[model samples]
Target chain A: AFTVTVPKDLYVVEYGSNMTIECKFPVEKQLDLAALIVYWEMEDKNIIQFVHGEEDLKVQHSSYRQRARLLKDQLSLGNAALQITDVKLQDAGVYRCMISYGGADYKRITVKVNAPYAAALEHHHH
Target chain B: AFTVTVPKDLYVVEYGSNMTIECKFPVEKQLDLAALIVYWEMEDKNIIQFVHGEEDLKVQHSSYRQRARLLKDQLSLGNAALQITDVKLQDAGVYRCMISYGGADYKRITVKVNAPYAAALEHHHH
Candidate 1:
């Protein structure tokens, strides 16, 4: 198991801005970076994946293609952070970051997207 | 615009079970069913539609076909409630029930799907 710390489990980002979610899971002596599996998912929908100590995204979900980016270079250090650009309405949801060495550790992340035009809607009288 | 009340704005239902999200809007004298366009959508994807005083689901999103059902029968009563059968992982999200007569009024509904195996995962140590 890794000592994980997500500064904010919940995120509120302005729409269309680039946003990053930090997923920190400290590695233990029991597990080696060479033998690890890390993956990010949204309700079982693949955002990205790393299996057998290698980034394997051949099966990334179509809806998330090119929209989500994983910090593959830092996976060796137990950092499973992710960055998404041009955030949109559909991008808001709970995402899970799962890491498996011998045992596993994971975190569920939430993001709230606010549209620029939302202020007008928020002031609705009807 | 109508006086809407969605008793439970948020819903939590067991996965694989049938669930309904009520969207009750009282039609005022200014709006009538004959001129109403009632529709339900999830993140901009169509679930069902009742337009022009009739049921118009010809353009319903492919993923939601048969899985989601509309209350066309109760449209005349300001009920735009939706029933989704066999609720699965993909069904968890924010849904909007919109009704437009002279003006538009809508409510955002959230549904959380609890998987049967979720309890085991909830007890995770790693």
Candidate 2:
């Protein structure tokens, strides 16, 4: 059975910090990266994509160009988590993790971004 | 007016990181620390308190015993921000900044805790 799993439905991330939303799948048989397709999405926008054993940067959203990735080394163990660095306030939303091993499988994870020091920008007096 | 002001209502903090929630009040008159009553609260629990120009640790909640404080030096200029160190997931909630200058005034601030790496705990299988 090739099932997708995530530890939690909601994830909270700090502003300008790193967040790794974990998504796991069944590695029941010998994995073949060339035949696999993995991607992360939010608001119908592609955050990152992997296919043919490598990242498909051309399909990734420009906003997440250098900030998001799926751990390639951990794929053999069913780890298909999306790691996002320098999280921003606009990054808060529900994210979908889509994976195609044998068939299409995906999971939705909500992300909430917090910035305790966010006020520093606006509260400044001239 | 001796009105209290907070830059934003919602603050996002990273797990195991430091957060400084800002609160400002009128410093029109010569500040008298001896008459000040400053504190931060959540769920009716006192996170930290300052009275008579010093911290009254006896009234602070155990979970935030030494982890929270109101910036003392900046008090003269109306900077009463609460600085909390080593933020945790359980710390996410609405917080109140209460101040007593001449009369009692307070403002509510919401805190959202995010831990992108939170899955490092439960996802571990034996």
Candidate 3:
């Protein structure tokens, strides 16, 4: 059975910074965007998804609607990494990515978000 | 006042992997190990320390005695990074580093640990 691959099990992100959770799967045969299926979830809450050659944000969780995405161009190469912009404390959690190009495979990555003591303290002032 | 510089505010480490929390400061005048003082703490618990140009583990917390350290040679260059071996889940937390060269400054870095779902599951079989 084919398995999904990720760079590492853990990812660290700074507050308000961008983060990319990398995931890859095997590619076989000619590429067909229409047949590709990609999904990302955290705690079973949909983060973002792709299908039928385009993004399908209909089911994405409200919190991630504007901040999470997958680069469509990389899909042809089996890259299904999820990129999150302006990472927040709430985004710290385990994420699972499921991809189906010619076949189905899935992997999970955990994210830990941190804020520097100085920056964290600065936020309290205003 | 010289300030500590850290590459980033957060660090990600895999289970059982070694990790280095970078901390640098400005160096002035000739090197004097006898005058250098460096310390690291997590939640106010001493992780490791250096004073009078040597590793001082007398007050190191029991849990970190064997796994944490600072390089003596790097002290002269203002590199007070803390290196931890065989990182564990408990190592995930905010770490504060205080360095005293000609002047004193401090910085904090947070660490997040992760275990892959597959590998984490595999450990249970034994």
Candidate 4:
């Protein structure tokens, strides 16, 4: 059997900014990057990925072409974080982290986004 | 500009059996289900979509043909959950939840899966 594990708490990012969601895995060294597969989902809808061997980033939907980025350095540490830049109000929901290795192991991490402006301002006023 | 937001928290699930990861979105009127798009990812790799219109499910990878499902009812309440059944050890890592609507807004939820049992006891656990 395979498993995908991730952090349980909330990682917050303000609007008009950027945030990274991390994903890690435990698998055979052979499958590290050669057979490794990673992709991201937002609010259970949009699907996008960072091609392992490819240079250009590809997403199923055109809208995400400029929005999602894959950090290769993290992969070395079993981390796959989908970075979203210039966030907006509509960017709040659940994001998932997924990894596939050895042609069988599939794992995932669920990341939740929250509105931070209001909270940030409230803290500033205090 | 559009946005895809998700939780920064990591929700973990074990391998084998079935698992459900939640995705929620904030959208405008009448565009909820009609214009919605949903999909999932493993790690920073593999991409799969759950057709909002068609009845039959389709996945880019034939290996996932029998593994992915979309929950429509959840959409009514601003939620989209991808259900995976009979998971394997390779099923470990991150899974993402994504939503798209109004031809612009994009949101995501990251879900991570972890190995519940040792590599040896995996076959016997479930």
| Sequence-dependent TM-score of model 3 | 0.47
Query: Per-residue CA lDDT of candidate 2, range A1-126, in tens?
Result: 345799888998778889999888888678888667777888658887787788878768898887887888889998898898888777898887767675444567899977766543542332
How does residue A78 of candidate 3 score in lDDT?
74
Residue A102, model 3, lDDT: 42
- Model 1, residue pairs in steric clash: none
DockQ of predicted candidate 2: 0.01
Candidate 1 fnat reads: 0.00
* Each prediction's DockQ against the real complex: 0.02, 0.01, 0.01, 0.03
Instruction: Compute each candidate's TM-score over C-alphas.
Output: 0.45, 0.47, 0.47, 0.41
Q: What digit string (tens of lDDT, one per residue) describes model 3 on residues A1-126?
A: 446899888998899999988898877766777656677878657887676667778878998979998877777787887899998777888997866554444567999889887766765574
Angstrom error at residue B33, model 4: 37
- Would you list the clashing residue pairs of candidate 2? A12-B114, A114-B12, A115-B12
Worst 10 residues of 4 chain A by lDDT: A102-111
Error of 3 at B23 (Å): 0.5
Candidate 4 i-RMS (Å)? 11.9
Global lDDT for candidate 3? 0.77
**Candidate 3 residue spans exceeding 4 A from truth:** A1-126, B118-126
Compose the digit string of candidate 3's lDDT tens values, residues B7-110. Answer: 88899899889998889887777677765668788865888777766776787999997788887667767788788999877788889786655444456798
Is 2 or 4 the stronger prediction by DockQ?
Answer: 4
